[PDB]
Amino acid sequence: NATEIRASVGKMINGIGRFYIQMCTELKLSDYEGRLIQNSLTIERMVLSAFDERRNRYLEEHPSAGKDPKKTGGPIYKRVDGKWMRELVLYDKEEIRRIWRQANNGDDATAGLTHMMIWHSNLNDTTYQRTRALVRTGMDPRMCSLMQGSTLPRRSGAAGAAVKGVGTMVMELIRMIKRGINDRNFWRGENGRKTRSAYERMCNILKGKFQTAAQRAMMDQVRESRNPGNAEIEDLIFSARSALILRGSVAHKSCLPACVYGPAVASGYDFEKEGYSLVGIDPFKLLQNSQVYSLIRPNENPAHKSQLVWMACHSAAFEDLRLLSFIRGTKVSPRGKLSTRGVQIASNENMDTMESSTLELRSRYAFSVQRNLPFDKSTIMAAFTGSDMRAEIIRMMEGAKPEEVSFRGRGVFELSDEKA
RNA sequence: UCUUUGUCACCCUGCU
RNA sequence: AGUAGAAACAAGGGUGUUUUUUAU
């Protein structure tokens, strides 16, 4: 029964909304500005960083004059004279937490917060790039397809594997191995056992992510590498190279920022009385009645930033180009075409001329086509840069492959088709 | 019983 | 595992530096 899970989603949303209207009562943020997105985004960032046992270690060490480690904050954004200002403020950890508990009947409800971190992470990946990290690893950048959701902490929602990507697993494993061959003490001790268990756990997560026989066999052979070595890296490399085709739909939860919260409850939709279906028509049934705004820099066409943030929230970073095209009815791409800059604002950047905009947040729109498309010969030439498996690997790899673009998963339907 | 970490590079030693 | 045999090896010791800002 979904409905008890829905009772869960309801209790967490109402706890969080209690805290939200409390915070506002401490914020008196205007209703108009109640939709300028960057404000509530950094507002989110606040409570995100607010939770860190490691930061607790930070304060314990007191290595630097970190801003009252027991208290945290960042730049906030109010206006004057129709123009806007920057304000560095900071709340106190225990105080926010105490709100949080009497916002959560004394509990925490980490669920919605982790959801918000999913939000921030998908935003980053959709809006930014980290090829320089691959430079730190040394493999093809265009491998990027499987970096969906890269920026998530090692202690964040572990079931987030729903979004944690293959390439993430690859690169983190390579890290562990690299650092592993950097020390013998790395394995001696209970630290060794616990890290080994977690390592194998990551391997098992990868198994779950794999769905084909030869892949299972190669990944298993990998798992047997009980000692950190070097060849395993290249095995994983070519396995990923073959899997570039061999992709299955991942969990893509159309997580939208919470800034809606005020207007969300003003619209009357508690996650309780109706639960929710985050995948399906429910997301598109809530991305039209809402309303959200954003601070604007001139001489950057506000329409570019519009499309960028819209699809960023849409989390379609690796969706079919032409699918997204018929999805919004006006051409889209990776950012290279998305001629704009970041949605937020940097410190030294001079806000002294910025502007405001009631931004557009809509689109055009069963499974008419399979969107199937083979690859290009460069894809197979990728292999020539290099067990029994490679025979089978090569075999299917040369005839014909079923899907060109990375992924095309969404419960989308027609807007006027709210039932289907 | 499903709980690595806020990130990596350089020296030296050869019986004292 | 193996060398070896009344106790050992299967290497041993030091040096670095993180809160933001983003696309080739």
Å between CA of A191 and C1' of B1 = 17
Q: A78 pairs with which residues across the strands?
A: A85
d(CA A333, CA A319): 9
Give domain limits for chain A.
2-119
**CA proximity to A205, closest of A250, A241, A245, A261:** A250
Which residues 346-375 of chain A have a CB under 7 Å from nucleic chain C? 346-348
Using C1' positions and the CA of A199, the closest nucleotide is B4
Å between CA of A184 and C1' of B13 = 18
Query: What are the helix (H) ranges across A26-165?
Result: 37-50, 53-61, 93-103, 110-127, 131-137
**CA proximity to A405, closest of A170, A211, A244, A210:** A244
Å between CA of A184 and C1' of B15 = 26
Whose structure tokens read 């194998």? A200
Using C1' positions and the CA of A52, the closest nucleotide is B6
3-class secondary structure, A349: coil
Q: Is A63 exposed, middle or buried (CB count within 10 Å of its CB: 0-12, 13-18, 19+)?
A: exposed
Q: A71 pairs with which residues across the strands?
A: A92
Chain C nucleotides with an atom closer than 7 Å to a protein C-beta: 11-12, 18-24
Are A252 and A258 in contact by the 8 Å Cβ rule? The answer is no
Number of neighbouring beta carbons within 10 Å of residue A339: 12
Residue type for position A82: G
Using C1' positions and the CA of A72, the closest nucleotide is C19
R_g over Cα of chain A? 23
Interhelix angle for A2-25 vs A110-127, to 10°?
80
**Is the CB of residue A172 inside 7 Å of nucleic acid strand B?**
yes
Q: Tokens standing for A319?
A: 């969706």
Q: What is the DSSP letter of A36?
A: B
**Is the CB of residue A132 inside 7 Å of nucleic acid strand B?**
no
Q: Tokens standing for A5?
A: 């899970």
Using C1' positions and the CA of A200, the closest nucleotide is B2
Chain B nucleotides with an atom closer than 7 Å to a protein C-beta: 2-9
Q: Cα-flanking dihedrals φ and ψ of residue A87, to 5°?
A: -140, 115
Q: Is A263 exposed, middle or buried (CB count within 10 Å of its CB: 0-12, 13-18, 19+)?
A: middle
Q: Tokens standing for A108?
A: 């925490």
**Is the CB of residue A62 inside 7 Å of nucleic acid strand B?**
no
Q: Is A105 exposed, middle or buried (CB count within 10 Å of its CB: 0-12, 13-18, 19+)?
A: exposed
**Is the CB of residue A334 inside 7 Å of nucleic acid strand C?**
yes
Å between CA of A228 and C1' of C6 = 37
Å between CA of A64 and C1' of C17 = 14
Q: A77 pairs with which residues across the strands?
A: A86
d(CA A348, CA A307): 26
HSE (side-chain half, CA atoms, 13 Å) at A11: 15
d(CA A157, CA A120): 13
Are β-strands A294-296 and A75-80 bridged in parallel, bridged antiparallel, or unpaired? unpaired
Whose structure tokens read 């006027």? A416
HSE (side-chain half, CA atoms, 13 Å) at A117: 22
**CA proximity to A244, closest of A385, A410, A403:** A403
Q: Cα-flanking dihedrals φ and ψ of residue A203, to 5°?
A: -55, -45
**Is the CB of residue A75 inside 7 Å of nucleic acid strand C?**
yes
**CA proximity to A143, closest of A124, A168, A160:** A168
Å between CA of A273 and C1' of C21 = 41
- List, in order, residues 6 or more apart from A181 with CB less than 8 Å away: A228, A229, A230
Which residues 173-232 of chain A have a CB under 7 Å from nucleic chain B? 175-176, 178-179, 182, 191, 194-195, 197-199, 201, 204
Å between CA of A137 and C1' of B6 = 20
Using C1' positions and the CA of A186, the closest nucleotide is B4
d(CA A99, CA A136): 41
Count the helices and strands in chain A (H runs, E runs).
16, 6
- List, in order, residues 6 or more apart from A291 with CB less than 8 Å away: A35, A263, A358, A361
Whose structure tokens read 């047997």? A224
Using C1' positions and the CA of A67, the closest nucleotide is C19
Å between CA of A228 and C1' of C9 = 23
Å between CA of A193 and C1' of C7 = 30
Q: Tokens standing for A36?
A: 């300028």
Are A157 and A245 in contact by the 8 Å Cβ rule? The answer is no
Q: What is the resolution of this structure in A?
A: 4.8
**CA proximity to A166, closest of A252, A254, A253, A244:** A244
Whose structure tokens read 């060849």? A231
